[PDB]
Amino acid sequence: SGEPREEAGALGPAWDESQLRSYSFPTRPIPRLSQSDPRAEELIENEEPVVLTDTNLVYPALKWDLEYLQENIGNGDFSVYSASTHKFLYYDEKKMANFQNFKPRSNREEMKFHEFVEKLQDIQQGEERLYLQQTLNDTVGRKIVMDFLGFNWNWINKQQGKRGWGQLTSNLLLIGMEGNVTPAHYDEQQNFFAQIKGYKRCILFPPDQFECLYPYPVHHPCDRQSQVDFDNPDYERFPNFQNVVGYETVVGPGDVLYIPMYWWHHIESLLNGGITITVNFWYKGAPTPKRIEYPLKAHQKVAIMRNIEKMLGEALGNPQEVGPLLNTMIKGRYN
Amino acid sequence: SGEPREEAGALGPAWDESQLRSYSFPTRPIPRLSQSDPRAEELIENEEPVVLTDTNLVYPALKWDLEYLQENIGNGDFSVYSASTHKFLYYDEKKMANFQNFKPRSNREEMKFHEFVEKLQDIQQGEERLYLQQTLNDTVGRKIVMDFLGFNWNWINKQQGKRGWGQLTSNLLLIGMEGNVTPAHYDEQQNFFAQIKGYKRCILFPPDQFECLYPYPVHHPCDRQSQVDFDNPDYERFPNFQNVVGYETVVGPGDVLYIPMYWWHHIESLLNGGITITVNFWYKGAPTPKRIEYPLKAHQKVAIMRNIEKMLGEALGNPQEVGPLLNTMIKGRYN
Ligand SMILES: O=C(O)CCC(=O)C(=O)O
Ligand SMILES: O=C(O)CCC(=O)C(=O)O
Ligand SMILES: [Fe+2]
Ligand SMILES: [Fe+2]
Secondary structure, eight states, X not given: XXXXXXXXXXXXXXXXXXXXXXXXXXXXXXXXXOTTSHHHHHHHHTTOOEEESOOOTTGGGGGOOHHHHHHHSOSOEEEEEEESSSBOOOOOGGGGGGOTTOOOSXXXXXXEHHXXXXXXXXXXXXXXXXXXXXXXXXXXXXXXXXXXXTSOHHHHHHHHHHHTOOOEEEEEEEEEOTTOEEEEEEOSSEEEEEEEESOEEEXXXXXXXXXXXXXXXXXXXXXXXXXXXXXXXXXXXXXGGGGOOEEEEEEXXXXXXXXXXXXEEEEEEOTTSOOEEEEEEEEOOOOXXXXXOSSOOHHHHHHHHHHHHHHHHHHTTOGXXXXXXXXXXXXXXXX | OOSOOBOTTTOOBSOOGXXXXXXXXXXXXXXXXXXXXXXXXXXXXXXOOEEESOOOTTGGGGGOOHHHHHHHSOSOEEEEEEESSSBOOOOXXXXXXXXXXXXXXXXXXXXXXXXXXXXXHHHTOOOOEEEXXXXXXXXXXXXXXXXXXXXXXXXXXXXHHHHTOOOEEXXXXXXXXXXXXXXXXXXXXXXXXXXXXXXXXXXXXOGGGHHHHOBOOTTSTTXXXXXXXXXXXXXXXXXXXXXXXXXXXXXXXXXXXXXXXTOEEEEEEOTTSOOXXXXXXXXXXXXXXXXXXXXXXXXXXXXXXXXXXXXXXXXXXXGGGHHHHHHHHHTTTTO
């Protein structure tokens, strides 16, 4: 992760190790570079993570905080997630019909910002934890729309153009509480993670560690999430979690982390670090080349495995038979 | 800026986008309200811009044009500014002694109105551009003095009384040519911008965008002006110009724009819109409250920075050392 950076103005260290959680695997630091540095462009083009420290991407939002937001964001509805533990168990509603025994571990709920601020206030007066996650569309107040327009769209748009990425699928505003943890998972789109308030420790695993992270079945509501409990790894069920090695960093106000598509990421708001605020940017990856180019990269093999699982689930007319058939194919033949 | 307003009498649109220049930043419309509307009074009291459409402030001047003026204004002298480009580079004479390498980019020149009208005529027979700017004192013809007396002094005086503003520092008559551009800058006084003939696009930036507009050093002849070339922004020298968001409008005959003190403003006479005529009104802001009131507003912090720069320039007995000392104070200590 690297030594805690010293804040300007002789203010103490931004954070200290005691705020970071302990895990069973090793890690090395993700590079912190300047957007002008040729090495940063090199990392992004090769689809490797990099923390850009001077993009000014969300510059107008650095002043944001709960008071400012509540007052100017408006009186619309915001999706607030809640959990009893620190780990926020998110899931896919549409895939619940496939796994009837799946009991929910986290509940969402629309509410007004001022309500979230209040509901958050008394919880600080507690084991419960909330996590607000909502898109930054025009639906919001005029002032917030001005700040939004003030983002460095010149930088990010140029970045989108040279990488060949597709459309910006969405912008997500995230406000969480200290200690909050979003378990490891991967997304299929390219992502620029812009930190605004507070610090978050981000642990990333490359796509080739698929075999050590044991993702749920594609048809399961937790598709794309790791089945391993990072706080208590079951080595009998997931032996290869003992070989996992990750890339880590702690991002703070002004930092932008590039999370390449298909890369795993574990995110946590530093303990006793106050609330955190982040805005993420999603872009569809560049279209896959017409003619295949070998040797296939790891993320491409992951795409293929996802496709096989999907096709099989439809061909058998039932996602619950996917596993049995796969075992039938493999046992005594390929294993 | 808003859709071009349709002129009365089924005359086409007042103007069309093709007449507006293209810039790298986003903008939203300044409210166009009636002076009777409570929202307008609310905007002015909170020191936010607003275009009042029915003040009748300069009603008698709406008939004005070059012929009428030349004939009745008199045979006195008028300060005419000239430039080779469209951007009029104005400067402070008194501060030239501090920056000897500063070469002038625009020249002033007293001349008689009929001469200005003539000099303007052949230029339309060209890259040169002129801009007449002179005060409306009794020095002028009897007829122009009658029109002047006919301004709605009842409205503006009442406005001056309720806002607590100081004396009317001056009245400026402005006559320019289509395409003319006055680069972004801020004034320290409150201003009512009364449009009389033609249309002008006005782009304003609030005081809190100080960090994105990079004003010249206080001792520089271009003090209060932005160092950024809006037509070709140097993002390496002024990275934060990528985060600038402005408030825009196009004022025409009869409109009065309130430009709050310390607010930045970029003004341009619509392309192929003919000459433009404007009269501005300057008032010293209301005296700063005896006991400070936190949290300080942005314009107050700008006042403080200007004061520090001024004091430092005198304390070191030389304005050229201000920068070196500021860097010495900051480097490795606050940055
Ligand atoms: O910040 C977080 O807690 C989660 C971020 C995340 O999963 C994402 O941006 O995809
Ligand atoms: O109309 C213009 O070109 C400039 C107006 C201006 O700068 C002012 O009224 O202070
Ligand atoms: Fe994610
Ligand atoms: Fe001005």
